[PDB]
């Protein structure tokens, strides 16, 4: 057969079981306005990733502290979270993870990091600027609004040298 048959693929998001729920609609619209999200698939993606992290943390927490698997997996998970900036550096216990929330994921988006740096007037302005390729990360132009910046690259985000 064609080698293209062995290529993998998967979905990335989940839809709520009860759609018409007033508080949920209000909160989702509030978040969309605050962070200027395009559609409601982004929130579903964030919820999916958060659920994955929470499930991993639960499974690890069920075990004993001195379980080799627990140590290995918790160390990897904490390192990833710290490198990504989602979890604060000073927290190094698996319990703290279960308290995380999607807003922490959102705060690490490129729009957010360039807005808190005073490099853009607004999230909408940030998106428009990102599309036109006036921005760079570590000397490389990034035009994806949902691109997530690691902590080590936070000070390396600047305006594109070649942009007008």
């Amino acid at each position: 057969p064609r080698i293209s048959r062995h290529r993998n693929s998967s979905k990335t998001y989940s839809t709520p079981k009860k759609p018409f729920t007033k508080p949920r609609l209000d909160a989702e619209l509030k978040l969309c306005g605050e962070y200027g999200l395009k559609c409601k698939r982004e929130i579903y993606r964030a919820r999916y990733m958060l659920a994955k992290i929470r499930r991993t943390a639960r499974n690890l927490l069920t075990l004993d502290e001195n379980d080799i698997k627990r140590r290995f997996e918790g160390a990897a998970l904490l390192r990833r979270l710290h490198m990504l900036g989602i979890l604060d550096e000073e927290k190094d216990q698996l319990d703290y993870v279960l308290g995380l929330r999607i807003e922490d994921i959102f705060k690490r988006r490129l729009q957010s990091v360039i807005v808190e740096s005073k490099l853009a007037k607004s999230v909408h302005h940030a998106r428009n600027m990102i599309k036109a390729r006036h921005i760079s990360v570590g000397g490389q132009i990034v035009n994806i609004p949902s691109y997530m910046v690691r902590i080590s690259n936070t000070s390396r985000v600047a305006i594109a040298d070649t942009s007008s």
Binding site: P1, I3, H6, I68, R71, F72, A75, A76
Partner: protein, 258 residues
């Protein structure tokens, strides 16, 4: 049921320890019959193309081999699918590179560079003694070689040193408690240790208990226990001495190399 023997090999059906990319292609090389079997060998092209990188395609390897640029146990081989196995001698005079094919702790084939003094021989495991035509005693080994008129003092599962130039036995190591060994099959490929116990069950397998240098103990069946000397190895071994680190230490080493 196929009406005859099999000539092809799907890539997904190839051995794991060959380390072949899923997207490389539909097919993988099918080794030809020779000194070693399909699951205890690795084709020459894989070594010459995907490791040493002296070639980038099948055709280049074909030219290199048909121009006589590699010697296996002192004999030039022109077959790209010739099987290479354990304790084989890989010499390339054009670049003065000499390697002995051994196992790493992870359980894969590795090339340990050697010297001139020890490249005139190899170690073989004797696993079968039988009478041939005219009642003449014989002896076979793991690399598909037979020797007539062996010494009566040589028994099964022993290890034999033979000169590459001449297939003549020099000295032999007995299978006994207290002898350094190397594991060549299963979950413990590449580990080195000393025999501590031997337990036999009538009509079934014989289990061998070995202890590593650090005090770790492990078990394996006698079918893949290889003697490599008398308390000290007879050949040069990889930089590591048959110590398998745990996942934690391997992760630390990876992070350090990052």
């Amino acid at each position: 049921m196929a009406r005859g023997v099999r000539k092809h090999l799907k890539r997904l059906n190839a051995p794991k320890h060959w380390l072949l990319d899923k997207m490389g292609g539909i097919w993988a090389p099918r080794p030809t019959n020779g000194p070693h079997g399909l699951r205890e060998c690795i084709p020459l092209i894989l070594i010459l193309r995907n490791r040493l990188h002296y070639a980038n395609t099948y055709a280049e390897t074909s030219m290199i081999l048909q121009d006589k640029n590699v010697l296996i146990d002192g004999k030039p081989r022109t077959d790209p699918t010739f099987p290479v196995g354990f304790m084989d001698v890989f010499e390339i005079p054009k670049v003065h590179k000499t390697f002995r094919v051994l196992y790493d702790v992870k359980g894969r084939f590795t090339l340990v560079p050697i010297q001139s003094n020890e490249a005139g021989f190899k170690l073989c495991r004797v696993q079968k003694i039988f009478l041939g035509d005219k009642g003449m005693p014989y002896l076979s080994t793991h690399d598909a070689r037979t020797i007539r008129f062996p010494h009566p003092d040589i028994k099964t599962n022993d290890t034999i040193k033979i000169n590459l130039k001449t297939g003549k036995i020099d000295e032999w190591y007995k299978f006994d408690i207290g002898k350094i060994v190397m594991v060549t099959g299963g979950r413990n490929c590449g580990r080195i240790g000393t025999i501590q116990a031997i337990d036999k069950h009538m009509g079934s397998y014989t289990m061998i208990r070995m202890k590593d240098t650090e005090g770790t103990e492990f078990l394996t069946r006698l079918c893949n226990v290889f003697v490599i000397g008398n308390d000290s190895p007879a050949v040069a071994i990889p930089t590591t001495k048959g110590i398998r680190p745990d996942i934690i230490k391997n992760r630390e080493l990876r992070l350090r190399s990052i």
